[PDB]
Ligand binder design. Sequence first.
Ligand code: HEM
Ligand code: HEM
Ligand code: HEM
Ligand code: HEM
Lengths: 141, 141, 146, 146
Amino acid sequence: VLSPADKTNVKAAWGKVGAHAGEYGAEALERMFLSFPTTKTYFPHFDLSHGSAQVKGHGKKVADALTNAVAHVDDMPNALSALSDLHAHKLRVDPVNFKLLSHCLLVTLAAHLPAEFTPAVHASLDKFLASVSTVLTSKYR
Amino acid sequence: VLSPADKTNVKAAWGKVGAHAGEYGAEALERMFLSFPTTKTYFPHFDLSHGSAQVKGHGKKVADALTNAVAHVDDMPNALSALSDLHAHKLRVDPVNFKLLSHCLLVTLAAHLPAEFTPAVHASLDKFLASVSTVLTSKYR
Amino acid sequence: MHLTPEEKSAVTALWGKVNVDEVGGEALGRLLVVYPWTQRFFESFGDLSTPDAVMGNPKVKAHGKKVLGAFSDGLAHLDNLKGTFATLSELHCDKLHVDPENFRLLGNVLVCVLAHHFGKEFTPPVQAAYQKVVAGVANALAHKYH
Amino acid sequence: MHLTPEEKSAVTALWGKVNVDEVGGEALGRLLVVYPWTQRFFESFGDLSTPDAVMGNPKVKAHGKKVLGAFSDGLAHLDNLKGTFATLSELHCDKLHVDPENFRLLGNVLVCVLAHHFGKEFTPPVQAAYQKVVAGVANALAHKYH
Ligand code: HEM
Ligand code: HEM
Ligand code: HEM
Ligand code: HEM
C-alpha cells in the first residue's frame, strides 16, 4: 500500500522527470535489454540497437503510461485497465519480467536524479513500480 | 482475483482434504525443506528430522490458517490480518519463499487427491495459494 | 549435473514407469491451463478456449509428446545436460523467442503431474531429485540465450 | 566466471574510483530501508526505525564496509568466485542462517548506488557488466548452502 508519504515522494520525483520521461523510458529499456537478455524474446520484431527509434518510441509509451499512473495513483486499476487487458490477453509477458524493467527504471532514475534519489525516495519508487506491476498483471488468469 | 468458479474449486478440494490438513501441512514442509534447502534458514531453532513434533505442530498451524482462509475466501485480508502482521513485523520471511511452500503444498495435494486434482482445480489452487501469499506479504513495507 | 547415485536412481526408476506420450500431453495441457500466458506461442493450435478444449487438443498433445520425448532422452545424459541441449537452447532463443521462464513453469507442472500420477510413490526425496533435474534441464535450455 | 574483455575492463575501471567505505555503508543502509524485512539479521545494530536512523547508524556503516571489502576481494578473483567465497558461503549458511535471496537484493541495491553515485558514467553496458558480476557473487555465496 502506498502511504501518503509514498505518494508525495513519487509525485515529487516524477515531477522532476518532467519532459525527460520519454528519454528515460528508452534508456530503461536499453538497460533492460543489455542486462537481462531474456527480455529481448518479447521484441523479435524490433531493431534493439542503441539509438533505435523503435525503442525510443516504445520508451515514450511506457513513460507516458507511468505518468498516467502517477496522476491516478489513488485509482490505478481503472486508469491502467486497457493496458492490463493488453498485457494479459495479447502480449502475455511473463510476470517475472516486470521486476526486471522496474529495476532498470530505478537505475535510470538514480543516474539522472542524484539529489532526489534519496533512500526514502528510492523505497517509495520501488513500492510504486511494484504496484504498477501488480496492476498490469492483474488479469493474467 | 479469485473467480466464483475458483472459490468453488478450492472449497471442494479443501473439503476433501478434511481431517488430513495437518498431516498434509507437515508433508508439504518436509517436501520444501528437502527440495529447497535455503528455506531451512528460517528454522534453525527446529528439529527438522523427519516426523519431528515441531514440524508436525507447525504443519498443523499452517493447515489451520489455510482452512481459515478457505472459510473466508471472500475476506482473506481480514481473516489473515494477524498472520500478515506476524510475517511482516516479526518473522520477516523473504517473499520468494512463499512461492516455494505453495508449490510444495500443490505437490502434496496432487499426491493425495487423485480424483480431485483436475487441470481446472490445479489452476484454482495455484491462484488460491498465490492470493494467500500476497495477503501474508502485504504489510512488509 | 551433480546428483548422488541415490538421486540418479530415484529418477531413472520412476521414469521407467512413465507413459511419455501421456505425461507429455498432460504436462503441456496443464501448463496452458494453469499459466494461460504460455498459450502465446500456440495460436496455430486452434481451440484453447477452455480447460477441456486445451486438454483435448490434438496439437497440444502432439507438441507435449515432442517436448517430453526430448526431456526423456536428456535423462540418459544427466552428466552433460548443457552439451545435450545446446542446439535446442539456440533454437528456442534465436528462432522461437521463448522466455526461459516458461521452462521453469513447465518443470514445476511436470513435478505436479508426476505427483498426481504416482501418488505416495512420489516421496519427498524423489521429488527433491526431480526438482534438481527439472532445474538442470531449464538451465541447460537457457544457457545459449543472448 | 565468464566475462568478455570489454565487460572486465568496464568493471575494473569503475571499481578503481569506488571508495569502498562510503559505497558499502550506502548499499547496506539502502537495503535495510528499501527491503526492511532484511533488518531481521541486524537486531543488535541499534536504531533502524527510520531512513535517517539507518543511514546514520555507525554499526550499519561498519558492517557495510566489511561486506564491500569482501566484495572487492572477489573482484580480484573473477575467474573463481566459488573458490573465493567458499568459506564465507559456509559461514552465511551454517552460522548466520542468511537466506541467499538477500545476496540478490544487495546486488540490485549496489547497482542502484553505483548509478546514483556515478550518473552518466554508469552506462547501459557498464550496468550490464555489473549485473553479471553481482549475480556471480550471489551465486558464489549461496554455493555451499545445504
Ligand atoms: C511498468 C511496466 C510496463 C508498462 C507501464 C508498459 C506499458 C506499455 C505500453 C503503454 C505499451 C504500448 C501499448 C499500445 O501499443 O497501445 C506496451 C506494449 C508492449 N509492452 Fe508493456 N509495459 C510494461 C512492461 C513490459 C515488460 C516488462 C515487457 C517485456 C519485457 C513488455 C512488453 C511489451 C511489448 C512487447 C509491447 C508491444 C510493443 C510493440 O509491438 O510496439 N511490457 N507496454
Ligand atoms: C501459505 C503460506 C504460509 C502460511 C499460511 C503460514 C502460516 C503460519 C502460521 C499459522 C504460523 C504460526 C503462528 C503462531 O505461532 O501463532 C507461522 C509461523 C512461522 N512461519 Fe509462516 N506461513 C506461511 C509461509 C511461511 C514460509 C514460506 C516460511 C519460511 C520459509 C514461514 C516461516 C515461518 C516461521 C519461521 C514461523 C515461526 C514458527 C515457530 O517459531 O514456531 N512461513 N506461519
Ligand atoms: C523441457 C522443456 C522443453 C524441451 C525439452 C523442448 C523441446 C523442443 C523440441 C525437441 C522441439 C522441436 C524442435 C525442432 O523443431 O527441431 C521444440 C519446439 C518448440 N518448442 Fe520447446 N521444449 C521445451 C519447452 C518449451 C516450452 C515451455 C515452450 C512454450 C511454452 C516451448 C515452445 C516451443 C515451440 C513454440 C516450438 C515449435 C513447435 C513447432 O514448430 O511445431 N518449448 N521444443
Ligand atoms: C555481497 C554479499 C556479502 C558479502 C561478501 C558478505 C561478507 C561478510 C563478511 C566478510 C562478514 C564478517 C565475517 C566474520 O565475522 O568473520 C559477514 C558477516 C555477516 N553478514 Fe554477510 N556479506 C554479504 C551479504 C550479506 C547480506 C545481504 C546479509 C543480510 C542482509 C548479510 C548478513 C551478515 C551478518 C548478519 C553477518 C554477521 C555480522 C555480526 O557478527 O554482527 N551479509 N558478511
